[PDB]
Design a protein around this ligand. Structure first.
Ligand SMILES: O[C@@H]1[C@@H](O)[C@H](O[C@@H]2CO[C@@H](O)[C@H](O)[C@H]2O)OC[C@H]1O
Ligand code: XYP
Ligand code: NA
Length: 330
C-alpha cells in the first residue's frame, strides 16, 4: 500500500469518496478508511431504531463514536436516515392502546425525532437522507405503502423535509433510493422530486444508492438517470455503491470464491462506472461505497442469507483488487 494511490486524492477534483461503517468496522478497517476516504456514513446506527428505540429514549452512543472518528480524521459525514419504511420501531405509529396514532400525533413525533437528531449533529454532518425509498419498486403506483404514508397522508415527505430544514437550514437534504436507474422507477423518482421542488420544498439532492450488479443497470441507463436527475437542478450523491457478483436471479449459495471471470468483469464494470462518474463531475459531488473491503458487506446476507459476496475495491485481506486499478485510472 505504500505506493498505492489514495482514492480521495485521486478524485480530489471530482467528488468525495466515502464508506459506510459501524463502530466495529471502523476498528477492523481503520487503516483503509484513514488512507482512502473523506466521507463516512453510518451503515445502521443513525437509523430510527438505533437512535430512538423507545419514545423519549435516545441512544446516540454508537452514532457519536462514528462522528468522532470522522471528525478526528477531517472526514465529512452523511446522515442516514430519518424517515424510512424499514428499521423504525413499532412505538412510533402506535398509541397507548396499541392502535395507530393520528396524523397530527405522528407529525409531532416525526418533528421531535428529526429536530433532536439533526440538532445534535449540526455543524458536523453536512447532509441528511431525509426520506429513504418512498417510491414503489414495483407496480404502477408512485409510492410504496408505509405506516408513515398511511397515517399522515402523501404529504408526509413534504413535512419531513421542512422539519429537517428548520432543524439545520445549512444541511443538504436528500431523497435517497435504489434501482434508481431503471427507467420506470427513474421516472417516478424524477416526478416525485420535481413535484416537491415545484412546491418550494427544501430537497437539495437525490441520492443514488447504486446497489448494482455486473450487468444492471446498463451504462446508458446510468447516464440517462444522472442526466434526468441533474436536470432538476439538484446535487447528486452516489450513496451506497457496491457491485454484486450475483444478478437478481442468481441465488446460488455454494460459491466459495468469485471466478476469474467475475473478478475481471467487476474490474471492467468499476472502471466503466467511474469513467462515467468523472464525466459528470460537475453534478456528482460524492461517491460513497456501502463498505470498503470484502471482509464486510451486507450483500453476504442479502438478498440470500448465509453466503459470500465480493462487491468492493479491496479484498478480505484489505488488498486492492483488479477493480481498484481500473477505478483509479479513469
Ligand atoms: O446491515 C444492513 C445494512 O447494510 C442495510 O443498509 C441498507 C442497504 O439498502 C439500502 O437501500 C438502505 O438505504 C441501507 O440502509 O440495512 C439493513 C442492515 O441489516
Ligand atoms: O431491502 C432493500 C432491498 O429490497 C433493495 O433491493 O435494496 C435496498 C434494501 O434496503
Ligand atoms: Na463534483
Amino acid at each position: 500500500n505504500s505506493s498505492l494511490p489514495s482514492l480521495r486524492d485521486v478524485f480530489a477534483n471530482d467528488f468525495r469518496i466515502g464508506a459506510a461503517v459501524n463502530p466495529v468496522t471502523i476498528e477492523m478497517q481503520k487503516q483503509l478508511l484513514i488512507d482512502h476516504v473523506n466521507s463516512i456514513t453510518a451503515e445502521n446506527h443513525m437509523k430510527f431504531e438505533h437512535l430512538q428505540p423507545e419514545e423519549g429514549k435516545f441512544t446516540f452512543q454508537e452514532a457519536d463514536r462514528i462522528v468522532d472518528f470522522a471528525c478526528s480524521h477531517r472526514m465529512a459525514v452523511r446522515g442516514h436516515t430519518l424517515v424510512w419504511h424499514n428499521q423504525t420501531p413499532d412505538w412510533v405509529f402506535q398509541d397507548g392502546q396499541g392502535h395507530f396514532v393520528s396524523r397530527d400525533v405522528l407529525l409531532e413525533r416525526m418533528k421531535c425525532h428529526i429536530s433532536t437528531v439533526v440538532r445534535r449533529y449540526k455543524g458536523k454532518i453536512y447532509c441528511w437522507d431525509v426520506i429513504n425509498e418512498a417510491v414503489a419498486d414495483e407496480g404502477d403506483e408512485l409510492l410504496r405503502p408505509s405506516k408513515w404514508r398511511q397515517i399522515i397522508g402523501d404529504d408526509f415527505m413534504e413535512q419531513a423535509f421542512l422539519y429537517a430544514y428548520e432543524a439545520d437550514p445549512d444541511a443538504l437534504l436528500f431523497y435517497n433510493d435504489y434501482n434508481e436507474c431503471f427507467p420506470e422507477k427513474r421516472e417516478k423518482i424524477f416526478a416525485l422530486v420535481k413535484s416537491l421542488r415545484d412546491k418550494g420544498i427544501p430537497i437539495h439532492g437525490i441520492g443514488m444508492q447504486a446497489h448494482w450488479s455486473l450487468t444492471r443497470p446498463s451504462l446508458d441507463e446510468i447516464r440517462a438517470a444522472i442526466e434526468r436527475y441533474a436536470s432538476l437542478g439538484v446535487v447528486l450523491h452516489i450513496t451506497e455503491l457496491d457491485v454484486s457478483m450475483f444478478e437478481f436471479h442468481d441465488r446460488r449459495t455454494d460459491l466459495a470464491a468469485p471466478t476469474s471471470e467475475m473478478i475481471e468483469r467487476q474490474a471492467e464494470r468499476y472502471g466503466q462506472i467511474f469513467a462515467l462518474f468523472k464525466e459528470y463531475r460537475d453534478v456528482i459531488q460524492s461517491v460513497t461505497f456501502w463498505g470498503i473491503a470484502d471482509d464486510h458487506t451486507w450483500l453476504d446476507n442479502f438478498p440470500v442469507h448465509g453466503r459470500k459476496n465480493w462487491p468492493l475495491l479491496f479484498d478480505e485481506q484489505h488488498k486492492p483488487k483488479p477493480a481498484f486499478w481500473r477505478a483509479v485510472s479513469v
